[PDB]
Amino acid sequence: MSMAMSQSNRELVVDFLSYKLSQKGYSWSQFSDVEENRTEAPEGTESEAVKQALREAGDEFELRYRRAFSDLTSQLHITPGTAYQSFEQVVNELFRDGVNWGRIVAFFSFGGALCVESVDKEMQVLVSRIAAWMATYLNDHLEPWIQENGGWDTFVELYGNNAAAESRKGQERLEHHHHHH
Numbered sequence: 001m002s003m004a005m006s007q008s009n010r011e012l013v014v015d016f017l018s019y020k021l022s023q024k025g026y027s028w029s030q031f032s033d034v035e036e037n038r039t040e041a042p043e044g045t046e047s048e049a050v051k052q053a054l055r056e057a058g059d060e061f062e063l064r065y066r067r068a069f070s071d072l073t074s075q076l077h078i079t080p081g082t083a084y085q086s087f088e089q090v091v092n093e094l095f096r097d098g099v100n101w102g103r104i105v106a107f108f109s110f111g112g113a114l115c116v117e118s119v120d121k122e123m124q125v126l127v128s129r130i131a132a133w134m135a136t137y138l139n140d141h142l143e144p145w146i147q148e149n150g151g152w153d154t155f156v157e158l159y160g161n162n163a164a165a166e167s168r169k170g171q172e173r174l175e176h177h178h179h180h181h
């Protein structure tokens with residue numbers, strides 16, 4: 001069978017996380033050390049698209065929601081006290097009106113960003129904790145809806161593409177300048 005969603009959640013936040021950490025020069029394997037096997041050219045399949053889509057869509061949300069991304073971190077001061085409680089309270093903001101592709105893409109970058117900051121200063125120990133909170137929320141606290149709507153292939157096919165993907169950014173000028181009455 002295909003048995004999708006078998007383990008593309010725990011390493012889903014770490015995959016996008018490293019993509020944002022490598023941009024700063026923090027990496028991830030050095031976060032909690034952990035035994036480093038190797039992984040030279042295991043191939044595997046690398047046919048995932050949610051990662052690529054989450055990349056472009058990542059900066060996408062960072063442009064229209066400028067006011068919505070102002071009271072999301074201010075109420076998440078990293079400190080030796082709260083962690084999943086306040087975190088789930090903030091992520092719930094996007095997962096409240098109703099699980100949606102956008103609410104699922106933004107919450108993604110919201111977590112990967114919370115770690116990029118904690119690691120930017122000097123806290124590379126709470127990265128697995130935050131990445132784990134989002135890993136569970138997607139393990140069984142959202143997957144059931146990701147399929148009810150259609151599947152990652154939907155949000156990844158609607159935008160995840162090389163560049164064309166039949167864009168529609170106000171593309172209402174052609175129409176032969178005289179073919180729509």
Ligand SMILES: O=C(O)c1ccc(-c2ccc(F)cc2)cc1
Nearest residue numbers: 061065068069072100102103106
């Ligand atoms: O598609 C949606 O419904 C949707 C609505 C809002 C947001 C969003 C994204 C980033 C924020 F900091 C706040 C809100 C994402 C998706």
Ligand SMILES: Oc1cccc2c1CCCC2
Nearest residue numbers: 057058060061101102105
């Ligand atoms: O569906 C969309 C259409 C336009 C922009 C964005 C999304 C979804 C998440 C990223 C931002």
